[PDB]
Enzyme design. Structure first.
Site, mmCIF file in Angstrom:
data_model
loop_
_atom_site.group_PDB
_atom_site.id
_atom_site.type_symbol
_atom_site.label_atom_id
_atom_site.label_comp_id
_atom_site.label_asym_id
_atom_site.label_seq_id
_atom_site.Cartn_x
_atom_site.Cartn_y
_atom_site.Cartn_z
ATOM 1 N N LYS A 167 9.588 -25.554 1.915
ATOM 2 C CA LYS A 167 10.892 -25.617 3.042
ATOM 3 C C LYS A 167 9.916 -25.029 4.281
ATOM 4 O O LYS A 167 8.797 -24.576 4.106
ATOM 5 C CB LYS A 167 12.005 -25.095 2.379
ATOM 6 C CG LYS A 167 13.046 -26.080 1.381
ATOM 7 C CD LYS A 167 12.599 -26.592 0.094
ATOM 8 C CE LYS A 167 13.956 -27.163 -0.562
ATOM 9 N NZ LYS A 167 13.689 -27.144 -2.343
ATOM 10 N N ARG A 188 0.851 -1.089 0.095
ATOM 11 C CA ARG A 188 0.077 0.048 0.005
ATOM 12 C C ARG A 188 0.889 1.308 -0.037
ATOM 13 O O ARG A 188 0.756 2.393 -0.794
ATOM 14 C CB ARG A 188 -1.146 0.053 1.240
ATOM 15 C CG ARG A 188 -2.055 1.075 1.205
ATOM 16 C CD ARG A 188 -3.100 0.678 2.218
ATOM 17 N NE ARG A 188 -3.846 -0.457 1.833
ATOM 18 C CZ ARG A 188 -4.088 -1.285 2.565
ATOM 19 N NH1 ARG A 188 -3.295 -1.304 3.678
ATOM 20 N NH2 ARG A 188 -4.813 -2.416 2.317
HETATM 21 NA NA NA Z 1 -1.388 2.509 -2.745
#
Ligand code: NA
Ligand code: NA
Ligand code: NA
Ligand code: NA
Lengths: 372, 372
Positions: free
Chosen positions: A185, A22
């Site tokens: 893993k 974001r």
């Molecule tokens: Na963004």
């Protein structure tokens, strides 16, 4: 359905990935640097470099030691193809040595005699043993042998982050050590890896190779040499950083699942129907691989397990059986253990969301199949 | 602070990444396959392969055409180091040709005379032009010239996904085309890339090389050849898939920002103080790079812009100035345009969250600096 693998991304990590995406802080950043610091402290090693994948770690290790055309590297017969492939991607030749039936790791005696009888034409430059499935056994012997013959040791610790060889963490004994963070893993970053070393020059050179020869100079970034791009994203690094502090505890629990498997399956072992792995001290149990007796067709066992709601698979490959590594030294030889493990090795579910009741179901299903 | 780059991950993508991480479906999956299909349809090209990064796309392109030791590839002087570096990482030699002052792309005439006077010793196998900053100009000429001299064309379209050369999408004219999804590129996946081609054998070979020589056989995965690991994660693919349908529209908007820059800055251009980029039809405007007149010290201009709250940077590097590509053909030559762009090229903010008011501030600040 009981799954072989169920990757575990902590919710904290998920929220942090969301914050990074974001905010738009994406490329290798403070997150990668911090992960590297945190890995180095976890391992007790001087330098860590996070990278695209465990193959990239092996590749950078090879390139940093200047291994390529005219050179040779010894690899184990039993491993994932990448081990031998990445050696030959540099132009060097993969020289195969068989593994030990007990550990699934390079047989140290067969390793020594392979060096003693080496007759070129390439220059033998390194040993690349695998600590297969998290098993540290043999590591100190590899170091000893490497030093005796003036060879580099490159630990393919793909499966073995958090594995320990006595007092010393797997990955920190080789000239360099390589880890995978592939989904199967125990710590995963989807794809990811780490290259570690106590050697400054190897670290500095691999770091150049990881990102286009770039380094911080007086007036910013300078391009010091030719390189590649094997950078890991910042948000992949964050995932890793959230799992690492839980990793020891995850391994303890996996060792507890192994105990439960050993409990249930020891009679079958004693009846000569399967062989169980030896979970030595410091084994991280990335994979729990048994060996079926020759009597059993692994493909049929797997199908029957699947019908009974249990996933399973082969453990790894035989490099000799792939017929890709054609040095004279390999074709003139007969491998015994790797080809056997390739055909009869069976990985059983073992992960962070398996419990006693699941293992009990797995074991009862396997028993009925094998005793039919 | 007005930023050069502000990566844009749609909230949908963020939520999908969260779903993938939580469900534990991490490795190249349906998500990568779908992205590849969606890229191929977007481009009108037969095959797409998503990979770790744009460097990996160029590398696989080289390896798929079997370019390495004893071979030579022509690259532009002005580009990111990776272009020339990845050629030499294969053992081939990077042969530098200067760019055109108007387009910042390989000069097609200097390209032709470089081929005509080529005197070995290596075999000239390919041309790797860059469609720099999203500029398609020259692409058909590169195809024409490549075909005339029986050479492969590898488009380094790192910056040019969604750029169009007349009727034809950038990336689809070369034997293969390569894209980057690095954070400064318009579609980003943090790190990521794509290799495309209309040729089946090149596609199939690169696909083997991308993942350890693996392919689907009768009884599951077979290991057909030696390879690398350049796989992209499933969750990185999802990010890409969410941006691609918005990409054309993002490019339209960037072309609108370019118009605003052209408006404000044309007097300065006319006064001989800067040169503006020519934003031809189909230019995707990944970067808006002007050229300062010699009078101006770019480092000082950048500092002044920074004090006035505006980020900026160099556009790209001069491969000749790096002194890393030491073929006789390069050292015996004098480059004019690339070294100039390297020293005086100035990238100005241009991205998805820049508006008219920002560009106005940028332009007024630059004006006051240049007219002092
Ligand atoms: Na963004
Ligand atoms: Na044999
Ligand atoms: Na989960
Ligand atoms: Na020169």
């Amino acid at each position: 359905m009981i799954k072989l693998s169920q990757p575990t991304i902590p919710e904290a990590a998920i929220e942090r990935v969301s914050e990074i995406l974001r905010s738009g802080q994406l490329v290798h950043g403070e997150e990668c640097e911090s992960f590297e610091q945190e890995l180095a402290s976890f391992l007790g090693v001087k330098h860590a470099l996070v990278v695209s994948n465990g193959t990239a770690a092996l590749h950078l290790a090879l390139l940093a030691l200047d291994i390529g055309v005219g050179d040779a590297v010894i690899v184990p017969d039993f491993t994932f193809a990448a081990t031998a492939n990445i050696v030959e991607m540099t132009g060097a030749k993969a020289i195969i040595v068989d593994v030990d039936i007990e550990t699934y790791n390079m047989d140290s005696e067969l390793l020594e005699s392979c060096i003693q009888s080496w007759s070129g034409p390439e220059k033998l430059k390194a040993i690349m043993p695998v600590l297969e499935f998290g098993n540290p056994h043999g590591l100190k012997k590899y170091r000893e042998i490497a030093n005796k013959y003036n060879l580099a040791l490159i630990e393919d610790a793909a499966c073995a982050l958090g594995a320990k060889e006595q007092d010393v963490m797997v990955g920190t004994v080789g000239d360099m050590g390589c880890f995978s963070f592939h989904p199967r893993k125990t710590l995963t970053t989807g794809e990811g890896g780490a290259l570690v070393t106590n050697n400054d020059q190897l670290y500095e050179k691999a770091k150049l190779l990881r990102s286009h020869g770039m380094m911080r100079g007086e007036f910013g970034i300078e391009f010091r040499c030719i390189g590649l791009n094997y950078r890991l994203t910042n948000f992949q690094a964050a995932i890793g950083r959230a799992i690492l502090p839980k990793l020891n505890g995850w391994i303890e629990r996996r060792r507890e699942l192994a105990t439960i498997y050993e409990d249930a399956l020891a009679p079958l072992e004693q009846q000569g129907l399967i062989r169980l792995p030896k979970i030595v001290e410091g084994h991280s149990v990335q994979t729990y691989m048994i060996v079926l007796s020759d009597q059993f067709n692994r493909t049929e066992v797997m199908k029957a397990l699947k019908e009974g709601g249990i996933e399973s698979s082969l453990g790894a490959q035989s490099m000799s059986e792939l017929k890709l590594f054609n040095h004279d030294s390999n074709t003139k030889s007969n491998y015994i253990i790797g080809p056997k493990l390739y055909i009869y090795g069976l990985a059983l579910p073992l992960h962070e969301h398996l419990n006693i009741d699941d293992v009990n179901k797995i074991t009862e299903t396997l028993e009925q199949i094998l005793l039919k």
